[PDB]
């Protein structure tokens, strides 16, 4: 093998998470792996980053780095820019306990850390397990993808979102390239009074599946396939361009006539 | 019947938020303009949360605080938490639309996915009018961004907009008379940001600041960058679907070719 793969490994659940430790161990059988991940398991970071403050890092004995109060984006950013020299070949984010599917992906810290590694020599991988049990399955799927990538370059697509059925490896049917499904709007709030009678509010669960058709990430994982969706960060909705332009003309906004 | 710039002093119910927080000049100038013709409820972060993007608070309940004028701050709340709570719990009657802004500084190109301004608008995408994110390319002409947003909202009152759930609006930092018009744009892109600014704490530990955005990369003629640089309001319709559809076949052929997850 002419060259070792050098991986920057991060996650949404922090350095202590079973998912990131299991992955790290499996990748280290063939690759050099630097962990740079949050100091703890926080929920709901998405792609936020810390701009109002500087960040502290801590290095463990095994060389793992925790960024203190770091988001997953902050971790990949420091890792790519300042803490690994030279820069990593690729960012791998995972294994996340829990699926990152459909229109949820924009809110996922696991996806966020991969999107921060989109400009490296390989497409970044975000790896989520549809459950909490078969980390070994997700780790073997990840190793298989990475072997694929060093065998033949993937030409287009800077981020792959990978969702792994929570199944023993022998039961996973295969791998499908998918698009993101969608959900109905989330609408539940759960109010709870504090001891003084003040109402506080919890964000409720996601809305029901809407677009879960045959070509979606939801469908593939349901049928026991690995789902691979390529993602990009361009939010432009190009199909709306003519409608919006026509509308502006019609209501006279930006025209005198 | 009577000739005024706007018909109705409260003809639409607006949930107004931002990521700069309730005390920011951009949201306070926008609130004051909007209240001339709309029924406005501010629900915004208790402080500046630039950097919050689409993050939300899941492992903790949120507490709200209501100011004398009725503005609501969500304590520790992100822009997404503010809109989600405003819409689903706090407002009665529910809003017809979410407006988020005016942000101090632009939200252009591939930065839009990192913007808390944009995230609040995207949490309002399911309402009857498309949500607006409004950002000023500068810090001076909040007045100009407010006039532009009021023009869009009067427009929505004349005629509903059919497709496009979220409009990302960037306004040049110019007097209104100097703004050239409006273009419907696409997001351009930047080089990766690459700077990390170290700074020692008083005990001699090294702390790190995230550096500024990378250089412009794709600022083509129909980009939001180009529009604003040329003195035009940029309007880009946005969606939340991250699927790189134009990569599907290539990824699919690559898989078949390396045979990952196949037997043979
Ligand atoms: Ca801001
Ligand atoms: Mg997680």
Swiss-Prot record, chain A:
Top EC class for this record: hydrolase
Keywords: Cytoplasm, Hydrolase, Metal-binding, Nucleotide-binding
Record's keyword annotation contains Metal-binding: yes
Pfam families: SurE
Gene3D superfamilies reported for this sequence: Survival protein SurE-like phosphatase/nucleotidase
Binding-site residues, a divalent metal cation: 12-13, 43, 96
Location in the cell: Cytoplasm
Lineage: Bacteria, Pseudomonadati, Pseudomonadota, Gammaproteobacteria, Enterobacterales
Cofactor note text: Binds 1 divalent metal cation per subunit.
Chief location: cytoplasm
Reactions performed catalytically: a ribonucleoside 5'-phosphate + H2O = a ribonucleoside + phosphate; a ribonucleoside 3'-phosphate + H2O = a ribonucleoside + phosphate; [phosphate](n) + H2O = [phosphate](n-1) + phosphate + H(+)
Gene source species: Salmonella typhimurium (strain LT2 / SGSC1412 / ATCC 700720)
Cofactors, names only: a divalent metal cation
Homology family: Belongs to the SurE nucleotidase family.
GO MF terms held by the record: 3'-nucleotidase activity; 5'-nucleotidase activity; exopolyphosphatase activity; metal ion binding; nucleotide binding
Function per UniProt: Nucleotidase with a broad substrate specificity as it can dephosphorylate various ribo- and deoxyribonucleoside 5'-monophosphates and ribonucleoside 3'-monophosphates with highest affinity to 3'-AMP. Also hydrolyzes polyphosphate (exopolyphosphatase activity) with the preference for short-chain-length substrates (P20-25). Might be involved in the regulation of dNTP and NTP pools, and in the turnover of 3'-mononucleotides produced by numerous intracellular RNases (T1, T2, and F) during the degradation of various RNAs.
The protein, known as: 5'/3'-nucleotidase SurE
GO cellular component: cytoplasm
Enzyme Commission identifier(s): 3.1.3.5, 3.1.3.6, 3.6.1.11
Curated annotation (Swiss-Prot), chain B:
EC numbers: 3.1.3.5, 3.1.3.6, 3.6.1.11
InterPro entries: SurE, SurE-like_Pase/nucleotidase, SurE-like_sf
Molecular function, one GO term: 3'-nucleotidase activity
Disulfide bridge positions per record: none
Cofactor: record remark: Binds 1 divalent metal cation per subunit.
Keyword annotations of the record: Cytoplasm, Hydrolase, Metal-binding, Nucleotide-binding
Coiled-coil annotated residue ranges, if any: none
GO cellular component: cytoplasm
UniProt record similarity statement: Belongs to the SurE nucleotidase family.
NCBIfam families hit by this protein: PRK00346.1-1 (NF001488), PRK00346.1-3 (NF001489), PRK00346.1-4 (NF001490), surE (TIGR00087)
Function according to Swiss-Prot or TrEMBL: Nucleotidase with a broad substrate specificity as it can dephosphorylate various ribo- and deoxyribonucleoside 5'-monophosphates and ribonucleoside 3'-monophosphates with highest affinity to 3'-AMP. Also hydrolyzes polyphosphate (exopolyphosphatase activity) with the preference for short-chain-length substrates (P20-25). Might be involved in the regulation of dNTP and NTP pools, and in the turnover of 3'-mononucleotides produced by numerous intracellular RNases (T1, T2, and F) during the degradation of various RNAs.
UniProt-recorded name of the protein: 5'/3'-nucleotidase SurE
Native organism: Salmonella typhimurium (strain LT2 / SGSC1412 / ATCC 700720)
Highest classification ranks of the organism: Bacteria, Pseudomonadati, Pseudomonadota, Gammaproteobacteria, Enterobacterales
